[PDB]
Amino acid sequence: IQMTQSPSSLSASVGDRVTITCQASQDISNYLNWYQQKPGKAPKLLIYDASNLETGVPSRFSGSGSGTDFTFTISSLQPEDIATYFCQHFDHLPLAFGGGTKVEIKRTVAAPSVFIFPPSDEELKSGTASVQCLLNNFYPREAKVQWKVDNALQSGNSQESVTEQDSKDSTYSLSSELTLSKADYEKHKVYACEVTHQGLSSPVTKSFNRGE
Amino acid sequence: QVQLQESGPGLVKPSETLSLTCTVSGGSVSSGDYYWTWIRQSPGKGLEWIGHIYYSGNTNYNPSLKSRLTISIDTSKTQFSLKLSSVTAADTAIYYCVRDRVTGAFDIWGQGTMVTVSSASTKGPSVFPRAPSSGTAALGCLVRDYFPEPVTVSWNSGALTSGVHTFPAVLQSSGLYSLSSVVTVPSSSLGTQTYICNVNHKPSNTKVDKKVEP
Ligand SMILES: [Cl-]
Ligand SMILES: [Cl-]
Ligand SMILES: [Cl-]
């Protein structure tokens, strides 16, 4: 039994009615469960037997369907409802999950707070240097971070990492790290991080001179 | 409520035998209402049902893994186990032990344990402080050059959670992971409040409490 969920992802505003679907390659009656998985956590059962609400689950969650087509509904999307939602059949073995529908939240644009961190003394003493540019609590997720070393545009020596969407204020945070050897790091003075984002009317640059 | 917890090596070599144990606490394992289940999750396979065992010892496996699958149960110790032999890089995943109602519902999950299939040896991380630069002040911790995943970070032993952002690990060109955790605090409390990030890397049994000073 191949389980097909749709859509793969969606973004909805807080308080919106959200409906996702799950299609089985053959009739599975009502032997269908829905699970909610937040990042870094195990899935949690919400709906069993296609339409029965699990004990303790808020009433804004519901499900329906029979045979092949099933739906899952959040009547009023809450900030804490962001997750990937899965359907799971138990018609016969082996049990199988759907691919999952990622429910994200649209909120108003929010500009990042930008911080820059020079490498510590003890990190340089180990032979490596990592300059971090921090973008805190912004929306949308899209953001451009460019590194400048003595006003020279870097390319290929930086890595980015973005958090999942916050379950309270629906923002993202991003860490951009410029990684160099201690020797290459000592060859330059000014290290700069330029941030372009929808919430900033102009790109923001945070920088420091080596040693401060 | 019943709690399930996986335990076992987070790193296993190819061809070798992956062994996991689930410890059921708070409730008995000799129940006729549940199938004691293993489920794994990876980006390439999604959520995949491995198999389960009934407290009488009868098992049911996924045909995809059936050749290399062994699930046992020990009702005296309230445990059930997973043995997966002849492991492949395709077996690297998060493994969960799950309680499944006989009516058909995974209603209790363990937190899941990350198993990486690699020829390399475990390496504990080095932890470096990201001192505040100086409104609100940002500080952080750099957890770098560890293997395998994962590393967990808390601040002040879990008493400081507001404003904490722990980023996903990044793979470096050296083949090791590095991770960053940050927290935003009022610049006023820098003098009076001490900030410790607690780094735990279970695969290497590494615990580090790194104080972040101005
Ligand atoms: Cl210079
Ligand atoms: Cl250290
Ligand atoms: Cl963590």
In chain A, the domains with their CATH numbers are 3-106 (2.60.40.10), 113-209 (2.60.40.10)
Q: Do domains B3-117 and B126-212 have the same CATH topology?
A: yes
Would you say domain B3-117 falls under CATH 1.10.150.120? no
For chain B, how are helix, strand and coil distributed in percent, rounded to 5?
A: 5, 55, 40
A12 touches chain B (CB under 8 A): no
B48 touches chain A (CB under 8 A): yes
Q: What is the DSSP string of B87-140?
A: --GGG-EEEEEEEEETTTEEEEE---EEEEE-SSPPBPPEEEEE-----EEEEE
Return d(Cα B55, Cα B37) in angstroms, integer.
Answer: 11
Q: How far is the CA of A207 from the centre of ligand 1 (A)?
A: 15
Other CB atoms within a 10 A radius of the CB of residue B192 amount to 6
For chain B, give every domain's residue range: 3-117, 126-212
Q: Is residue A89 within 8 Å of A24, Cβ to Cβ?
A: yes
Cα torsion angle, B177, B6, B51, A57, sign: negative
Instruction: Note the ligand closest to the C-alpha atom of A184.
Output: 1
To test the contact with chain A by mutation, choose from B182, B208, B213 the residue with the greatest count of A C-beta atoms within 10 A, namely B182
Q: How far is the CA of B210 from the centre of ligand 2 (A)?
A: 8
Return d(Cα A171, Cα A190) in angstroms, integer.
Answer: 30
Q: What is the DSSP string of A80-120?
A: GG-EEEEEEE-SSSSPEE---EEEEEE---BPPEEEEEPPP
| Cα of B60 to nearest chain A Cα, Å | 8
Return d(Cα B179, Cα A176) in angstroms, integer.
Answer: 11
Nearest to A117 among B104, B140, B166 (CB): B140
The residue of chain B nearest to residue A132, with distances taken between CA atoms, is B130
Q: Is residue B181 within 8 Å of B130, Cβ to Cβ?
A: no
Residue count of chain B = 214
Return d(Cα A14, Cα A37) in angstroms, integer.
Answer: 19
Q: How was it solved?
A: X-ray
Given resolution (angstroms): 2.2
A177 touches chain B (CB under 8 A): yes
CA B29 to chain centre: 23
CATH of B126-212, one of 3.40.630.40, 2.60.40.10, 3.40.50.2000, 3.40.50.300: 2.60.40.10
Q: How far is the CA of B129 from the centre of ligand 2 (A)?
A: 9
Q: Is residue A207 within 8 Å of A116, Cβ to Cβ?
A: yes
Range A105-133 burial, b when 16+ CB lie within 10 A, else e: bebeebbbbbbbbbbbeebbeeebbbbbb
Give whole-number Cα distances, A144 to A55, A118, B189, in Å. Answer: 44, 20, 32
Return d(Cα B14, Cα B72) in angstroms, integer.
Answer: 22
Q: Which of A124, A106, A89 has its CA nearest to residue A170?
A: A106
Whether omega before B148 lies within 30 degrees of 0, making that bond cis, reads yes
Contacts of B107 in chain A (CB under 8 A): 45, 48, 54
Q: Is residue B39 within 8 Å of B96, Cβ to Cβ?
A: yes
Q: Is residue A97 within 8 Å of A191, Cβ to Cβ?
A: no
| Cα of B107 to nearest chain A Cα, Å | 6
Chain A, window 120-159: residues with a beta carbon less than 8 angstroms from a chain B beta carbon:
120, 122-123, 126, 128, 130, 132, 134, 136, 159
> Cβ of A113 and B138 within 8 Å?
yes
Task: HSE, CB side, 13 Å, CA atoms: give it for residue A165.
Answer: 23
